[PDB]
Design an enzyme around this catalytic site. Structure first.
Site, PDB file in Angstrom:
ATOM      1  N   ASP A 181       1.092  -1.128   0.051  1.00 55.19           N
ATOM      2  CA  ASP A 181       0.030   0.094   0.049  1.00 55.19           C
ATOM      3  C   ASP A 181       0.934   1.202  -0.071  1.00 55.19           C
ATOM      4  O   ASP A 181       1.885   1.387   0.795  1.00 55.19           O
ATOM      5  CB  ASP A 181      -1.022   0.162   1.318  1.00 55.19           C
ATOM      6  CG  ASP A 181      -2.349   0.312   0.913  1.00 55.19           C
ATOM      7  OD1 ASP A 181      -2.369   1.319  -0.044  1.00 55.19           O
ATOM      8  OD2 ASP A 181      -3.272  -0.295   1.251  1.00 55.19           O
ATOM      9  N   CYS A 215      -6.990  -0.899  -8.005  1.00 60.04           N
ATOM     10  CA  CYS A 215      -6.157  -1.325  -6.846  1.00 60.04           C
ATOM     11  C   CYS A 215      -7.023  -1.220  -5.742  1.00 60.04           C
ATOM     12  O   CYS A 215      -8.247  -1.763  -6.106  1.00 60.04           O
ATOM     13  CB  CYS A 215      -5.003  -0.488  -6.770  1.00 60.04           C
ATOM     14  SG  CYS A 215      -4.989   1.121  -6.901  1.00 60.04           S
ATOM     15  N   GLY A 218      -7.976   2.903  -6.823  1.00 61.33           N
ATOM     16  CA  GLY A 218      -8.036   2.879  -8.303  1.00 61.33           C
ATOM     17  C   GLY A 218      -7.287   4.349  -8.751  1.00 61.33           C
ATOM     18  O   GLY A 218      -7.658   4.724  -9.741  1.00 61.33           O
ATOM     19  N   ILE A 219      -6.144   4.716  -7.855  1.00 60.93           N
ATOM     20  CA  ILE A 219      -5.648   5.952  -8.246  1.00 60.93           C
ATOM     21  C   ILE A 219      -3.970   5.871  -8.095  1.00 60.93           C
ATOM     22  O   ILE A 219      -3.167   6.350  -8.836  1.00 60.93           O
ATOM     23  CB  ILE A 219      -6.058   7.169  -7.472  1.00 60.93           C
ATOM     24  CG1 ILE A 219      -5.947   6.993  -5.819  1.00 60.93           C
ATOM     25  CG2 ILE A 219      -7.486   7.763  -7.644  1.00 60.93           C
ATOM     26  CD1 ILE A 219      -6.286   8.253  -5.008  1.00 60.93           C
ATOM     27  N   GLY A 220      -3.582   4.961  -7.063  1.00 58.36           N
ATOM     28  CA  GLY A 220      -2.066   4.860  -6.775  1.00 58.36           C
ATOM     29  C   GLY A 220      -1.119   3.979  -7.789  1.00 58.36           C
ATOM     30  O   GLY A 220      -0.755   4.370  -8.564  1.00 58.36           O
ATOM     31  N   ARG A 221      -1.347   2.621  -7.205  1.00 59.17           N
ATOM     32  CA  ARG A 221      -1.001   1.662  -8.012  1.00 59.17           C
ATOM     33  C   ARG A 221      -1.469   1.643  -9.462  1.00 59.17           C
ATOM     34  O   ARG A 221      -0.523   1.524 -10.554  1.00 59.17           O
ATOM     35  CB  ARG A 221      -0.951   0.150  -7.430  1.00 59.17           C
ATOM     36  CG  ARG A 221      -0.326   0.328  -6.168  1.00 59.17           C
ATOM     37  CD  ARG A 221      -0.722  -1.144  -5.476  1.00 59.17           C
ATOM     38  NE  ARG A 221      -0.638  -1.201  -4.015  1.00 59.17           N
ATOM     39  CZ  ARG A 221      -0.712  -2.110  -3.328  1.00 59.17           C
ATOM     40  NH1 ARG A 221      -1.356  -3.261  -3.646  1.00 59.17           N
ATOM     41  NH2 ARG A 221      -0.319  -2.150  -1.930  1.00 59.17           N
ATOM     42  N   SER A 222      -2.641   1.696  -9.576  1.00 56.63           N
ATOM     43  CA  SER A 222      -3.628   2.027 -10.870  1.00 56.63           C
ATOM     44  C   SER A 222      -2.929   3.109 -11.722  1.00 56.63           C
ATOM     45  O   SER A 222      -2.814   3.098 -13.069  1.00 56.63           O
ATOM     46  CB  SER A 222      -4.888   2.061 -10.484  1.00 56.63           C
ATOM     47  OG  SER A 222      -5.621   1.086 -10.142  1.00 56.63           O
ATOM     48  N   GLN A 262      -0.198   8.566  -5.590  1.00 56.86           N
ATOM     49  CA  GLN A 262      -0.331   8.902  -4.327  1.00 56.86           C
ATOM     50  C   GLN A 262       0.656   9.503  -3.341  1.00 56.86           C
ATOM     51  O   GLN A 262       0.247  10.093  -2.210  1.00 56.86           O
ATOM     52  CB  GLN A 262      -1.091   7.588  -3.660  1.00 56.86           C
ATOM     53  CG  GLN A 262      -2.639   7.587  -3.871  1.00 56.86           C
ATOM     54  CD  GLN A 262      -3.364   6.638  -3.103  1.00 56.86           C
ATOM     55  OE1 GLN A 262      -3.101   5.300  -3.521  1.00 56.86           O
ATOM     56  NE2 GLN A 262      -4.098   6.770  -2.029  1.00 56.86           N
TER      57      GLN A 262
END
Ligand SMILES: O=C(O)C1c2ccccc2Oc2ccccc21
Length: 284
Positions: A181, A215, A218-222, A262
């Site tokens: 995370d 993810c 839906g903003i960081g890894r994605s 993020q």
């Protein structure tokens, strides 16, 4: 400025936190009024992550057309992506309705169902061939066809059929299972190997609807996945690959969904992934 030199200049100066806040400051702000309607409160995983109204995906139903999902349409690169949250217990049927309606071939999952001892998304696909899933709210059936488990990730072949007719399409499932995370992949090597497996499947190609990428929020890894893919495609298309400006591509993508990338470490890893991946794009 060659990003590889921009990279060493930021690293030697330790200014990643400063670069990242400058992006946060310049990022688009558009209304998300539909996301905030009281009828939609149980359709959102996080109070502070919502799709803009102008780019949100609409469900094809009169009752309530809302899902926490955005269409990212890259004009220069000729690639589209749908970025969405991990499905909730009451939105797993909406999730598969969207895949059906948008004609997607691929789903890309960058999280584990449990991380840090808490649930990060619903178990939304079947784990055994003989135990299929039926979504009564949207009239869909989902069956596990095959599973290929590798060291960094798992690929699944799923059958999706319209229980309104008899149209049968096979959806592929690309599950990265080692990404932590607000964290970064192990070496961009395993993340790039994964990105090239999604590409080789046809899932990102214009003969299909957009890939669905998630993810937890839906903003960081994605964000890291679509940013790396688009930047490498631009380097392949342009006369001058050194003209690709990763910060400018990220701000373009933030016109379509808030908050992509993020942390300052996610920004640094995105640079590393593009720099290491270019050593293939440029003929090696
Ligand atoms: O570039 C295009 O022909 C078309 C497009 C046109 C204007 C603006 C954005 C845009 O995005 C995409 C994405 C994927 C495939 C095609 C397109």
């Amino acid at each position: 400025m060659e990003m590889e030199k921009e990279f060493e200049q930021i690293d030697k100066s330790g200014s990643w936190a400063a670069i990242y806040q400058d992006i946060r400051h310049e990022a688009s702000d558009f209304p998300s009024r539909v996301a905030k309607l009281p009828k939609n409160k149980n359709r959102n995983r996080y109070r502070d992550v919502s799709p803009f109204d102008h780019s949100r995906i609409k469900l094809h139903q009169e009752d309530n057309d809302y899902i926490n999902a955005s269409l990212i349409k890259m004009e220069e690169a000729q690639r589209s992506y749908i970025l969405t949250q991990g499905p909730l217990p009451n939105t797993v049927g909406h999730f598969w309705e969207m895949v059906w309606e948008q004609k997607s071939r691929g789903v890309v999952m960058l999280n584990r169902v449990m991380e840090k001892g808490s649930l990060k998304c619903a178990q939304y696909w079947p784990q055994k061939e003989e135990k299929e899933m039926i979504f009564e709210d949207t009239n869909l059936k989902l069956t596990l066809i095959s599973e290929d488990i590798k060291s960094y990730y798992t690929v699944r072949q799923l059958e999706l059929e319209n229980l309104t007719t008899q149209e049968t399409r096979e959806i592929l499932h690309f599950h990265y299972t080692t990404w932590p995370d607000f964290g970064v992949p192990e070496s961009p090597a395993s993340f790039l190997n994964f990105l090239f497996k999604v590409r080789e499947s046809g899932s990102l190609s214009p003969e299909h609807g957009p890939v669905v990428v998630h993810c937890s929020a839906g903003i960081g890894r994605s964000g890291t996945f679509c940013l790396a893919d688009t930047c490498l495609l631009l380097m392949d298309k342009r006369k001058d690959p050194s003209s690709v400006d990763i910060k400018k591509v990220l701000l373009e993508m933030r016109k379509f969904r808030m908050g992509l990338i993020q942390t300052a470490d996610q920004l640094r890893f995105s640079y590393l992934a593009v720099i290491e991946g270019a050593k293939f794009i440029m003929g090696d």
